[PDB]
């Protein structure tokens, strides 16, 4: 399925909000996000069907 996902963030250190769109064309995933778990202080992994989203900022992982 095509999917209009909604990325966003709100820093406490900056007290600031921002956001991004995240298209997902032809995804076989159907499930809601979660269970979630941060993969680091700067980065998080989250369940999305069998697949797992990985997101981060300032990360050395990238």
């Amino acid at each position: 399925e095509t999917q209009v996902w909604e990325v966003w963030m709100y820093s406490q250190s900056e007290k600031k909000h921002r956001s991004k769109s995240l298209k997902m064309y032809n995804s076989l995933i159907i499930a809601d996000p979660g269970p979630s778990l941060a993969v680091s202080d700067r980065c998080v992994a989250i369940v999305l069907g069998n697949y797992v989203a990985l997101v981060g900022y300032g990360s050395e992982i990238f």
Partner: protein, 375 residues
């Protein structure tokens, strides 16, 4: 989350530049069930609905291990990992597996006690240590029965060795409990459905339970949930009347941060900048995940000031006056009495699934506003 091509709006800020998001192409045949993670962050492990096992490295981005379902037993009630992340444990209802990943070999297999179908909970505990040259572990096995198993498990590269040690049998069915290892000593928290908060603690050979004092003012409350910071060995404790922040070992209640009533199964805490100066364990900032009890909006209260505005004398390593002379850059920062901590509101829709960062510094999450077919 595969799609034929993911996309996001082109960034105009360095605030978003380092911000990034990537797939791991490797996957379960079918949707995820449950997972567990190493403290090192380098290691990761996962299981699907098909209960295939997968483990993966985070920084080196290279495959570590894969296991198909038919290699595995029909029942798989539980899962657990060592803090090093160098080894793996699995609980089929009748017998546990212990397998290395970095050096894939059958380190051990061992039958163990169970009382089906009461819900499992599990905790690893590192020994006197000597990795890699020699090792040991202390397998806690919490149960909804309120039984709490503990096992010896000395292990060496020669081949994992095993022996049972003790069977705790705590009163009443349990809401929650967690491991808490101070560098000085092992300790383990234990909430009851009764709301009792016992803690076993390892005085070496001694393994002493102790009755932590939830105090008289709100004893009757159904708890939401206790949560703490094991590296801080500090006990936060949910109540609608105000969370406890009780001390361990020498043990005392300190203070209760002012809060809105909060939904059960929600409470958790995170902190920036771990350090252990002068025996103290101060952190740069603190933050507070929980779903709201009523409005049910996601909520993450913040505390601390910073970047240079404040330093957190969380607890005191010794609740005594002290004059040890070593450099304390934090003294240049303003002292924090509880009064100025000043929570920072940011109520948000539940629909945006989201988590507080482990350091508590940053919010992250997503939701689908909409989706559509190939047509």
């Amino acid at each position: 989350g595969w799609s034929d091509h993911d996309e996001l709006s082109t960034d105009t800020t360095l605030h978003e530049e380092k911000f990034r998001i990537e797939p791991v192409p490797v996957h379960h045949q079918l949707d995820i069930l449950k997972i567990a993670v190493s403290e090192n962050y380098k290691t990761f492990a996962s299981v699907g609905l098909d209960r295939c096992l997968v483990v993966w490295d985070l920084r080196q981005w290279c495959t570590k291990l894969v296991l198909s379902k038919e290699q595995m037993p029909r029942t798989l009630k539980a899962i657990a990992l060592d803090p090093q992340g160098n080894y793996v444990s699995l609980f089929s209802k009748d017998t546990l597996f212990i397998l290395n990943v970095e050096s894939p070999s059958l380190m051990l297999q061992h039958s163990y006690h169970c009382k089906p179908n009461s819900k499992l909970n599990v905790f690893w505990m590192p020994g006197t240590h000597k990795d890699d040259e020699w090792k040991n572990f202390e397998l806690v096995v919490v149960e909804s029965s309120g039984e709490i198993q503990v096992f010896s498990l000395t292990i060496e590269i020669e081949g994992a060795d095993i022996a049972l040690v003790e069977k705790f049998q705590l009163s009443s069915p349990i809401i929650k409990s967690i491991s808490i290892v101070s560098p000085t000593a092992n300790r383990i928290a234990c909430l009851t459905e009764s709301g009792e908060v016992t803690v076993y603690s390892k005085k070496g050979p001694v393994w002493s339970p102790k009755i932590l004092s939830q105090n008289k003012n709100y004893l009757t409350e159904t708890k939401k949930d206790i949560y703490g910071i094991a590296m801080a060995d500090i006990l936060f404790l949910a109540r609608d009347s105000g969370v406890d922040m009780i001390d361990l070992k020498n043990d005392e209640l300190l203070h209760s941060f002012t809060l809105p009533p909060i939904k059960v199964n929600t409470f958790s805490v995170g902190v920036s900048n771990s350090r252990f100066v002068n025996g103290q364990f101060r952190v740069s900032s603190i933050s507070f995940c929980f779903t709201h009890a009523v409005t049910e909006k996601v909520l993450y209260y913040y505390y601390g000031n910073e970047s240079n505005e404040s330093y957190i004398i969380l607890n005191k390593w010794d609740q005594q006056p002290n004059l040890v002379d070593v450099h304390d850059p934090d003294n240049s920062l303003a002292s924090l009495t509880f009064d100025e901590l000043q929570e920072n509101i940011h109520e948000v829709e539940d629909a945006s699934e989201s988590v507080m960062s482990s350091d508590g510094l940053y919010i992250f999450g997503m939701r689908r506003k909409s989706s559509s077919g190939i047509s």
